[PDB]
């Protein structure tokens, strides 16, 4: 294809820049397939993502150009970002397939969870996630869905942030990974159907560092009425005045709960499970943890506070902390809505931008 | 030190 060339990727075809080769498979919807691949020109590793079907029904077309948009108000070291998008056709009548590439890491938060790890690295790690999550904030991206699974990380011990604003999935992490569901990380604001805000994430790295030191899920629910039980037989039943913002046939069945008495954070996370002067840090790490880990979302730690927090604090860094997002993300575009044809047009402008 | 590392 002169500056394209085509390789065979399973019972799917990939039609690639001459600059990408040693193209495998990694990931599979679905909604698409993710192949490793190696950047001649940038002598590094890539993911390059094939959408699948992205002009098959009004939907697919609305969310493909959508996961455009959103990559376009990014510009963070913490999250993943479109290192190029491409597409193998020469023009809009014959335009139908979609390409994104975007940094290759080495893992997922899984493969770090059964690690034994130190508090210079945890608490990293956890800077980095508040890092990322902020800026998504200040996108006007709340992500909702973070999980270990969408979460990435390098050998270096770098780490950025995977699917905000996708559904489940449609998003990359779905196709590919040691799979894990979201139900298990889910702001109870989000799983009451009260609503949420910003801080709806803390609790989602709140499960996601409790992971971290138990090498063990905090709230495996086996559905959504068990992982309520989970939460509350561990945390405690949340005060009057957090149960009166609930809707009423919900409201009265929480009320209806067997009151439960929560554990005490030091017995969720013994010292034992922690590792001298590093022991002030186990002190640090589990009352940052009693932060997160809270169910009414008023009292609730926000992202800014958390990196204030003692424990995250050592890694402070204005750069990485106040970097701003190129761009905002319109909301008003959800409520958009477009012909297939339409749709690919809009992609299509946004491709050869 | 930002210069730590993490092996699989």
Known sequence: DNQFYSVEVGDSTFTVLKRYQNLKPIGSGAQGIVCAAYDAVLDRNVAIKKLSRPFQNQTHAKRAYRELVLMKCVNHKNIISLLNVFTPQKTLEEFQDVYLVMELMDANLCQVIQMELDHERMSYLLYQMLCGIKHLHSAGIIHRDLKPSNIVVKSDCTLKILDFGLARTAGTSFMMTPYVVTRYYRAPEVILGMGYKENVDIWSVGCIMGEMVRHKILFPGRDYIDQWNKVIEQLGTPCPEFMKKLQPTVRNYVENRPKYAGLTFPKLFPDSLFPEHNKLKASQARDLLSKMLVIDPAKRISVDDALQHPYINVWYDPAEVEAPPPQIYDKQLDEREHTIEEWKELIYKEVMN | ?8
């Open chain 2, 1 to 8: 030190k930002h210069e730590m590392t993490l092996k699989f």
